[PDB]
Amino acid sequence: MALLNFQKPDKVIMIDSTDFEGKFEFRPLEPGYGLTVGNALRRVLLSSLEGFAITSVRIDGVEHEFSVVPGVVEDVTEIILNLKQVRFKRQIDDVESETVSISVSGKEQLTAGDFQKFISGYQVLNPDLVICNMGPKVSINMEIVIEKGRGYVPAEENKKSNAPLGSIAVDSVYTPVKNVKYSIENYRVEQKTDYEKLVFEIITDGSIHPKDALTEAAKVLIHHFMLFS
Template sequence: MAILDFVKPDKILVTEFSNKKGIFHLKPLEPGYGITLGNSLRRVLLSSLKGFAVTSIKIEGVKYEFSTIKGVAEDVTEIVLNFKKIRLKQIIPGTQKEVVNVVISEKEKIITGKILNKFILGFQILNHDLVICNKEEFLDLKISFTIEEGRGYVPAEEHKKENIGTIPIDSIFTPIVNVKYSVESCRVKQKTDFEDLSLEIKTDGSILPKKALMEASKILIQYLSIFSSEKIDKKEKVKIKRNKKKYNEEFSKMRTLLKSKLSEMDLSVRTKNCLKLASINTIEELVNCNRNSMLKMRNFGKKSLDELEGKMKEKGLYFGMKTSDYKL
């Protein structure tokens, strides 16, 4: 059966474009498709694109994050937060990880992203004016940090701590700074209920907004293509039927057990007599009892209760069972 014709845009209109910002218009869209596409693309853009970030640092002479360094204005916690702000761009294709060893000479007083860039091979720090720390003159400072590839946001706890002195960092891998979308009405011939989707994408400069939009679209297509093919596994239907059959068998078995007499439980004569005196004759009546109230029965002690609970456990029974579910 042919799919009914939808009004679809034949191209995307770009109204603003730079290395870090792009505004894209998609029109005309059928009613409701603006929000559907805008929200889906926004979520994928913010959470699913690959990027690079610093995942750990190590400073010579520092064992823990909550430390200070003699001759450095910032404490280690502040330095860690500054490394977290670093935005990176891959400059050698295929580079997914790099351990950078930095030796700051005595004459350098202000350590910035520009200085760190001198020691990096496969990547480039984009915010080169970012101040990492301020130090006194005539102080050598040795820092090593690891750059890795990832998606979205990964907390420090999820980074593997290699050894003492290595400080894991919360990593913001996503190259997307912000995504906004809006939907307005537009006209197609005489109809005015069609939609114009405006999508504003801001990146950190490591990826062009246009490429980011393309990557997000590909991810959505990969997921949605599963539903548009014959890949829906028919075996799952068989599995569901088997599970349902198993459930029905267990349901029927429990229902029969609850309707049974207490003689089915192979109890001691003393316990049987105590239950009989309390007018408890079926397993259903037994499981409806309160455990604490059992000890109040005449001649029924802790030993009898332990015996009874042991037998009940063997059959998957317990005090306070909801027997109404079994339609008794």
């Protein structure tokens, strides 16, 4: 009941936001609260937000990741490292895992967009990402598995004992947030100039909108702080 004189903000205001970048404001804030809110949100954003990535890859005729596909300039290791960089945005709800069979032939370059004609539940956010350079007569038949996770899971943990022969597990970087930057500026409310204004700049991979990322980070923070009731 002593919370009368603490000036709390009314809403979070979105200045400019795309599917990849978003700028947000938080005002008015008591002195010192801007840093608390900003740092908590930044840590939760860079730590615990869910995402989608690839867990297993099987290239036809390739038995281990230290081999080479005939006619392909890049070795299987470089193909794996490029496949790690593909980003997915969910298109169909309740889809947690999908197996994608990819067969590409007659092209001089395998891009991530070529996977889109075979993926049903996910959308490739960077179709311009080149997986490998091949000859015009090279036929590439690969199977990738897309799963949901948080943070980083090494390829050692992604190895399934029931996987078919030739399946190569890959490192998965599930994090959807690329950068969180916050600033604290002073704000004048009536006669007091000591109130604080919080500015948020979030760069995402496109899988989660910056506003949704802020909402999910706040949801995690509320879930953690309810336990002290």
